[PDB]
Write a protein that binds this ligand. Structure first.
Ligand SMILES: [Cl-]
Length: 194
């Protein structure tokens, strides 16, 4: 990378090189994120707990985003467009790739977009870290049926499919192209653009 890159190890949000970024983990010291130029960042993690890290936008919406990634999980991790809404309090994931485990939940249907078919799922997390604290909230999922690590995500197509399936989003908080890890190790480099 560049000597001007910044390596992040503490929970934080902010802006870097034109883009919002978020870094969150319950396992500090097990994961780091390096913020590169433009829409790029890398992560490196080792026997972590839970982390989510990525670049994107502080306010999500129906963006058409293009991303290129190198995604190298050892164990449970996702490469995913990740975001939050409030009222309803929902975390949503458009999962592009995963490691050892393909995330699934309550089947809600399918959506075909950006040359790929995604299964739609809903899950709940109970008493869990959220943008509003320890809460019980919904997760909306679009999980691609086959892994990919570059391409375009027409986010509005996912939002529309979810609405058709009765899954309603609230007011948008942040929206990032994220690396997300659970009790695993690995690395990633992710580059995005709108
Ligand atoms: Cl830091």
């Amino acid at each position: 990378g560049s000597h001007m890159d910044t390596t992040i190890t503490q929970n934080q949000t902010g802006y870097d090189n034109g883009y919002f970024y978020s870094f969150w983990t319950d396992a500090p010291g097990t994961v780091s994120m390096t913020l590169h130029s433009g829409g790029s960042y890398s992560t490196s993690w080792r026997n972590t707990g839970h982390f989510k890290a990525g670049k994107g936008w502080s306010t999500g919406g129906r963006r058409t985003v293009t991303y290129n990634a190198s995604f190298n999980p050892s164990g449970d991790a996702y490469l995913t467009l990740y975001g939050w809404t409030r009222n309803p309090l929902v975390s949503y994931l458009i999962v592009e790739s995963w490691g050892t485990y393909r995330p699934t939940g309550t089947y809600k249907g399918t959506v075909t977009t950006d040359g790929g078919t995604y299964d739609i799922y809903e899950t709940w997390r109970y008493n869990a870290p959220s943008i509003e604290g320890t809460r019980t909230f919904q997760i909306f999922w679009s999980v691609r049926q086959q892994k990919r690590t570059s391409g375009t995500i027409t986010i509005g197509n996912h939002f529309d499919a979810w609405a058709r399936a009765g899954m309603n989003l609230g007011s948008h908080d942040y929206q990032i192209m994220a690396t997300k890890g659970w009790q695993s190790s690995g690395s990633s480099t992710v580059s995005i653009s709108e």
